């Protein structure tokens, strides 16, 4: 049926949940975050595949990395204009972390893709390749979630009342 | 540190829950429905306020009424372009109530607006004004709900693709 890596789906789902709180209009970070969440959800469906899903998996990691780059790039620009010393520090912390994680996600997605449908690989080896990928994916989803929040706080103080600003408008929260 | 009108929020939420199932693209009824739900949600907060929220409440009601008028207008156009007699009757029946409800909402929210802050008004009078406004809000949200549903049904048997008719595409559920 529909076998799919629950830890990976869980993490995508939570990154999606954090981002869906904001309108994407006037906020490219929010849009890139929503894009990531969706790609990660697809990747949770790819981990369980045959030799045909190898290139699909490598590509998925790549597109995720492209989105991560955009989040990083925009967060730096938001930080450059942040007046707040502590917020700016926190923002800058993740714009350092995300690129490292995204590079590793690419490596790990590739190592996993070369193992898909291959019967000549150890059951432990493959399982570890998954765990390493899942762990990394979780770190990525976390860093991005944290970036969304620091950048929202950084829009409270802005420098020169001029230049660059992300639009932080909620989409109305209903109780469940 | 802030209250809301839970019955009004509930009514707003369940109109929203029905509308969110579809794409606003090629469907102005869905767009107006989504607009209403959001305004009705804001109104639930505005009911619990001081003299500063008076004009904000009157404005909201005016905006809800404007969206109601658009829903009715489009529903009536959908009904003319329909061939099934009973579905056309159900839709015209449902949507014809909306303008009178919206008008009663403009009346009752004005009543409530003038009572906000005001310490010279009875506690029973102010409670009843809310109950009247809440009840009306619910009838309005339900009618719009019913209209959206009946408009979707009326899109099935149309006029040999003859006039302009609405796009009923289910928004892909995020998963
Ligand atoms: C069952 C056994 C089994 O699946 O074996 C795998 C083998 C793949 O070898 P295949 O015929 O695809 O041809 C090579 C293979 O795809 C390599 O993976 C490619 O390099 P890398 O992988 O990108 O480094 C190499 O590209 P290039 O480097 O030569 O241009 C390709 O030429 O065959 C199948 O997958 C189809 C069957
Ligand atoms: C993004 C890339 C992409 O997939 O674009 C395709 C576009 C999606 O909508 P598109 O992005 O152009 O823009 C939508 C528009 O801004 C709506 O107002 C948003 O909410 P709602 O609609 O009032 O609820 C909706 O929410 P969100 O999805 O951005 O959160 C926006 O997507 O259209 C289709 O998929 C249907 C066929 C055309």
Swiss-Prot record, chain A:
Chain positions found as Phosphotyrosine: 175
Tissues where the protein occurs: Metavinculin is muscle-specific.
Record region (C-terminal tail): 6-176
Region (Facilitates phospholipid membrane insertion): 45-88, 162-176
Signal peptide: none
Top-rank taxon: Eukaryota
PTM characteristics: Phosphorylated; on serines, threonines and tyrosines. Phosphorylation on Tyr-175 in activated platelets affects head-tail interactions and cell spreading but has no effect on actin binding nor on localization to focal adhesion plaques.
Similarity remark: Belongs to the vinculin/alpha-catenin family.
Function in brief: Actin filament (F-actin)-binding protein involved in cell-matrix adhesion and cell-cell adhesion. Regulates cell-surface E-cadherin expression and potentiates mechanosensing by the E-cadherin complex. May also play important roles in cell morphology and locomotion.
Disease: Cardiomyopathy, dilated, 1W: A disorder characterized by ventricular dilation and impaired systolic function, resulting in congestive heart failure and arrhythmia. Patients are at risk of premature death.
Entry domain remark: Exists in at least two conformations. When in the closed, 'inactive' conformation, extensive interactions between the head and tail domains prevent detectable binding to most of its ligands. It takes on an 'active' conformation after cooperative and simultaneous binding of two different ligands. This activation involves displacement of the head-tail interactions and leads to a significant accumulation of ternary complexes. The active form then binds a number of proteins that have both signaling and structural roles that are essential for cell adhesion. The N-terminal globular head (Vh) comprises of subdomains D1-D4. The C-terminal tail (Vt) binds F-actin and cross-links actin filaments into bundles. In isoform 2 (metavinculin) a 68 residue insertion in the tail domain promotes actin severing instead of bundling. An intramolecular interaction between Vh and Vt masks the F-actin-binding domain located in Vt.
Subunit structure as annotated in this protein's UniProt entry: Exhibits self-association properties. Part of a complex composed of THSD1, PTK2/FAK1, TLN1 and VCL. Interacts with APBB1IP and NRAP. Interacts with TLN1. Interacts with CTNNB1 and this interaction is necessary for its localization to the cell-cell junctions and for its function in regulating cell surface expression of E-cadherin. Interacts with SYNM. Interacts with SORBS1. Interacts with CTNNA1. Binds to ACTN4; this interaction triggers conformational changes. Interacts with FLII. (Microbial infection) Interacts via its globular head domain with the central portion of S.flexneri IcsA (also called VirG).
Protein name: Vinculin
Organism listed in the record: Homo sapiens (Human)
